[PDB]
Amino acid sequence: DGNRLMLNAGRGNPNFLATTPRRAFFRLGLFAAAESELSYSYMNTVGVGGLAKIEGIEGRFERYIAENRDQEGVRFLGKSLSYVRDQLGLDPAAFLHEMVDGILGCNYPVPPRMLNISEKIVRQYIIREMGADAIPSESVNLFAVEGGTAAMAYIFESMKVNGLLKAGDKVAIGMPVFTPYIEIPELAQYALEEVAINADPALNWQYPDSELDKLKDPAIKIFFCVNPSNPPSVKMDERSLERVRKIVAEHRPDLMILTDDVYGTFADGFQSLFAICPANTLLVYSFSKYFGATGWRLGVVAAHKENIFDLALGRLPESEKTALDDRYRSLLPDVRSLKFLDRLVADSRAVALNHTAGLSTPQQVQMTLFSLFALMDESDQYKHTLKQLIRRREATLYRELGTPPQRDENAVDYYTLIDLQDVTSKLYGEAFSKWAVKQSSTGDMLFRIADETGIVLLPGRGFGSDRPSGRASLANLNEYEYAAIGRALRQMADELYAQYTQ
Amino acid sequence: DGNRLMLNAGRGNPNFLATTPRRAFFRLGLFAAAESELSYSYMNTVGVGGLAKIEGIEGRFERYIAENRDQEGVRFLGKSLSYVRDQLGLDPAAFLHEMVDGILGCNYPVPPRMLNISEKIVRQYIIREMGADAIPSESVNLFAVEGGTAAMAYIFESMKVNGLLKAGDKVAIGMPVFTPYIEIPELAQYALEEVAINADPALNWQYPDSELDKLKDPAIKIFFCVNPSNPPSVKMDERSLERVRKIVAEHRPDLMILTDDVYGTFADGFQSLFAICPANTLLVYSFSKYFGATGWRLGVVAAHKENIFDLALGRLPESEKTALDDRYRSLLPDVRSLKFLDRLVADSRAVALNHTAGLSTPQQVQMTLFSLFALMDESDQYKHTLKQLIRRREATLYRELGTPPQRDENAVDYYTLIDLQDVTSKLYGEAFSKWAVKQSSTGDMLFRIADETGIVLLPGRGFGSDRPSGRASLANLNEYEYAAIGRALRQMADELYAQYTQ
Amino acid sequence: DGNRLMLNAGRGNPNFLATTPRRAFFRLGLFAAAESELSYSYMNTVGVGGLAKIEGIEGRFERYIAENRDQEGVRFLGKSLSYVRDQLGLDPAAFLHEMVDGILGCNYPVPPRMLNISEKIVRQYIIREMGADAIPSESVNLFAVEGGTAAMAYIFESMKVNGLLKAGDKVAIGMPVFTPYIEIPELAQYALEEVAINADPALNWQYPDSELDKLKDPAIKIFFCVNPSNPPSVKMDERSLERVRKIVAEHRPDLMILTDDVYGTFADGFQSLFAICPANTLLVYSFSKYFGATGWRLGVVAAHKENIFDLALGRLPESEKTALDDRYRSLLPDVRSLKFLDRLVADSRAVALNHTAGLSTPQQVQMTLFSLFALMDESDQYKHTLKQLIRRREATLYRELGTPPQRDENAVDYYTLIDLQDVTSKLYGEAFSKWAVKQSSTGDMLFRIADETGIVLLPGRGFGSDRPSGRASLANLNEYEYAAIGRALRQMADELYAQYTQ
Ligand SMILES: *Cc1c(COP(=O)(O)O)cnc(C)c1O
Ligand SMILES: *Cc1c(COP(=O)(O)O)cnc(C)c1O
Ligand SMILES: *Cc1c(COP(=O)(O)O)cnc(C)c1O
Ligand SMILES: [Cl-]
Ligand SMILES: [Cl-]
Numbered sequence A, B, C: 001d002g003n004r005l006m007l008n009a010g011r012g013n014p015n016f017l018a019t020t021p022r023r024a025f026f027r028l029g030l031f032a033a034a035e036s037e038l039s040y041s042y043m044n045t046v047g048v049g050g051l052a053k054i055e056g057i058e059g060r061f062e063r064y065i066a067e068n069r070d071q072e073g074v075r076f077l078g079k080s081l082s083y084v085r086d087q088l089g090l091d092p093a094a095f096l097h098e099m100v101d102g103i104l105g106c107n108y109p110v111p112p113r114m115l116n117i118s119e120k121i122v123r124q125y126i127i128r129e130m131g132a133d134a135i136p137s138e139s140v141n142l143f144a145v146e147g148g149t150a151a152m153a154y155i156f157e158s159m160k161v162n163g164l165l166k167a168g169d170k171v172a173i174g175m176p177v178f179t180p181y182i183e184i185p186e187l188a189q190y191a192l193e194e195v196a197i198n199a200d201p202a203l204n205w206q207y208p209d210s211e212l213d214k215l216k217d218p219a220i221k222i223f224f225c226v227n228p229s230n231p232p233s234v235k236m237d238e239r240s241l242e243r244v245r246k247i248v249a250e251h252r253p254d255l256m257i258l259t260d261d262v263y264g265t266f267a268d269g270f271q272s273l274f275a276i277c278p279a280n281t282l283l284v285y286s287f288s289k290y291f292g293a294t295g296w297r298l299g300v301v302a303a304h305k306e307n308i309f310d311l312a313l314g315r316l317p318e319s320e321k322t323a324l325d326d327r328y329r330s331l332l333p334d335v336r337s338l339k340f341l342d343r344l345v346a347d348s349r350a351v352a353l354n355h356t357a358g359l360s361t362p363q364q365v366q367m368t369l370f371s372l373f374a375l376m377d378e379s380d381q382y383k384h385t386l387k388q389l390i391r392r393r394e395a396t397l398y399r400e401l402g403t404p405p406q407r408d409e410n411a412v413d414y415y416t417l418i419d420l421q422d423v424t425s426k427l428y429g430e431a432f433s434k435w436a437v438k439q440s441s442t443g444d445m446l447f448r449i450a451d452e453t454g455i456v457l458l459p460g461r462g463f464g465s466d467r468p469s470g471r472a473s474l475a476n477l478n479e480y481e482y483a484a485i486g487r488a489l490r491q492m493a494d495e496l497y498a499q500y501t502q
């Protein structure tokens, strides 16, 4: 399943996971279960509870924390309350009841877009990790969704439905990008045309100015990028972000930006395009990778309250405004005041079902607890732990290839590129590396590792020339498995060197 | 929020919830958390775990159950294992690891449609509650989705995409139905035409043969019904099910049926249209109402392995088959073998994202635990408890209107119709009831209750004549609130009688 | 072993068992162990105790119950004391010491026939479950034996020894009966002649009046029947019991009746022939099936204090009375006052060993605890639980054969008859069922299930015509195993229908 996921979906699945916010969730659940039972009125039954009451919830919660000081999840829950009440200044009783009611999953999400306090908490996390601090928190709204996967499906459908993207429109795509994102515009369902914004291996996988300038073409309605990138696993540098900023400000104030920033926390000092061009950007952030929460399906779509999506909607042709008046008629009297972010919500479940739309309340609670976990960790201990783990696995991989590729300030390294030439160069000089590349390819490299270790790697391209290389995730295997990849690739190189000399 | 949900979405939200399977979930979570920590290799860190190991899981689980015999959730978990292993004959280690891995939400759902053992467990529950026992379990497949809400959105979109429903096609809709289901075909996005299959108040809200025969019109491609009904809250009787069966067998073997059977468990001896016409029916079942789990967003789409949806797909015009070959190309070599149920899955997240599609693994685990809860309860104690609760609230409501409407074998009563004429008839004779109806309407009835009690009711129509009536849910309020509705409606009747006499 | 038991012994072995009276037994054992240690006088030894003292036993027992309120077995023991003392009016100290001394197995059973208080307790259970309430409790005596198996061996041997049954005497046997009971009279050791009292499939396996009238033949000395029957699994109806009653009263006051009523508790409102003709009947009751206690070997022989066995003994020819005077000489001065029930006891172990004869004291204690368990359960919860379990397994079996045979008021259903004709009739009409029977037999039916499922069934006959049928026990398998039998038998029927049509 780990090997099959990389081939099919270009992921990625970590073998680590955040335990403390998970324990806090299950412990909160036991508290909420007791809260439900406090509202059950009848004798001689079993298995039926009532709704949790907001009245006196703080005092009951405080007792629960005091009696269970020995439980890690409970201590976390205790500090979470302080963080929300004391640092965020939010209503403590309202926070607790939203969490209790939320984890019970006994009420339809209200509002459907996101639960009130969860939105306020999660956006603090999002703003911080995206480097978007210069934007007032109150100007950022979130739509809680079933991972980045759901976000992308919802966004393209709403773009189509609301006439923001039309058949024949050009979508610029920062490349190399993983397979799934190439196909969605290529669907006849959308019939969009791709323009490649190509990263340069000579610039260490940054986008050249010349490539970024392609965005000046007014036929290009949207810039779509994974940042930090996947496969290449680098973050857009200061120059690149500035270039986009100037292009938007100077030439294309109408350019929509769709940015997928799931790997952000794995970079040093990450800054999102959302931070740089908030009015022009829809941010997709997934909790999957950082918290080891792929199965939880936790994501948000973020939008600035003043954005070009709502501006474009006000500039639509009359026939389209009339069609949308009909579409959203049941939702509100004035459809023209219905914002794009809330249209995403309505479009996600056929409009008529808007009031039972949204991410499940226990999922939002869990998302909120992951968010708190990271926010309360001021010295970034969890982040550093994961980074040290990733570096250890890297050292182990390149042990006999030695050693790892040199990493700059823009490095992410969730993924690593094992380049045959660079490896054979490090081992046996420049002359040998030129020859070794002409002998074997990516196929012979990936098939050998697979046969020796049972691990299949991603080809390392490209698009390029088929420079013989493979990509491994530093997130999904254990040390001896990275050591076995290195050993198999070292024997392959050693046998090439014995076929070099003689 | 309770009053606002009935007006907007025609629900419904229960104030009861199943506690035991929820406690089992949170307890399983604590076990899984410990399982994750067993795979963590490093010192001097906190909050990071590894992946749960299948090896020796039974023995560890058995210890967990033995040490926590005093915990209700744990005892349930213990019996669940026996039920799965002993009664269902499934692999106990594989069940446990699916549940442990599932609740950790650390792996993408695999397969995306449903987790393997969860599917087998949940379909046992579905088949039993739908009265579909005559169908072999192995011939029923499920797609786990975000409630009935997601199911409906997914189904219509896939119908459109795969050319099973086309603009101008007629959709027959069993009525009265709640608002949301009237609007989805009416969307320009689908441009479908509605044909009303009208329930008869004289038949106690059953569909007359003459109304059911409307399905013979070959322009009608789908029969769409909520069964048991909402608002009317009755199940289709033996005659009605037989009529549809003959119509499908005799005249319309091509008729698709879409049935929403969320209220099934609240009827006595429920039998689904899925049981009667499995080859022709897509079953939508929601866990929301029965388990008090609206916020969990838990539903399945059920299909027979041999169905008319796949048959129609094989009979599509060549241009459509060519378009679908392109659409699903990345999924499998032979797109023509891709079944409609799996197309729902692929269509739910844009095709290219099929391998990260599906309901979150902790949601499927919770769904599995609700399913087990009901399956293991042989004497149906929970079902009876809820029914007694509903009846008590009914008795309390009609206490001063006295007494409740007579209920037949097809009665559900999650909702109750408070008919002014019938109430005033029971109180002051037939002559007075005829006059009292001409004086006040549904509006004056609903506005009075709202002003006196703060509870807003649904109008009781119709479509009919505006016979002055209101609908209350027996699931969402407490006893004194039902008593206050009765009292307000009794004083209204008493003041009408003092304006009658004089 | 489960499959091998049905073929060899015509059983039957349940996969359920009564746990509470078993836990009570083991808990009582720990109390008794401590009682023994209270009588041990010496230092510096281990593993040796003394005899439990009756003095102060109530107070010590009451402390034991109070300290162990959390133990299910102990709570049962506590309520047992109340039942014996308060409802039965028996000596509480004497009850406790009999139980304590009994479970220690440190004294020879005294008296050998049954322990005093155990007899009083167990007969209350027997009288109730046999519907024999009209008989005063004090007029019923029991001989505790090693299951019904030992009872039958003991009874025939004593019948022979005491000249109540002689070579060439006719034994009437209610049939169909299971194999073991056909062979015991056929032994040259007894040389008895069988007369078949045949049950009628047209009467749903009741004995016709014409068949019951066969008992008028004065050459028939004993009527031997399993009631409720095995294999057929029905109880004798009101008419049948009345017929025997009149035959005994009117024509055959000398007719001995031997009735085996092990399945009694699985019928609704069971009434034994012992209840109807107590003076003429020896009742054999086994605890094996109802309590899931086959390995415990627990049975009683019941006799009325005024019976025709003792009457016949007084009418024996002088040469036989002289021989029996010699045989029983050591037992009592007046052998002619030695009752048949006590002769069973003496005959069971060669007469000279009468005073070390009888069922082991821990077995009698366990029997007493099973008896209490059922007596104290006023709402018959355990009985209903087992019946619901049996019905669930039946529903699961006939799921695809659908559905189960219609059951009347005389139904027991521990066993179920799977009739090919009736099954194929229910599925494909009367015409097909006539043909399907001519194609395959019982052999082809039983061998197919065995090969597909690994379960071997009993042939369903007869004696009859070999109507193609099989018998399954609803007591010995789990749900998926019944489901696999149904599925194998459905595919067999479906392939017959494809060989019917074409
Ligand atoms: C892993 C990954 C995601 C996260 O997907 P979810 O559906 O949120 O789990 C998003 N984008 C990219 C490019 C990824 O590699
Ligand atoms: C409540 C209800 C449902 C359940 O909705 P979910 O989205 O599954 O919570 C489905 N159909 C009808 C008609 C209802 O009233
Ligand atoms: C099972 C059974 C018994 C019980 O036998 P024990 O020796 O008491 O276990 C007695 N009679 C019949 C006909 C049976 O099937
Ligand atoms: Cl914890
Ligand atoms: Cl618990």
Ligand SMILES: [Cl-]
Pocket (backbone or CB within 6 Å): C023, C024, C027, C071, C072, C073, C074
């Ligand atoms: Cl115990």
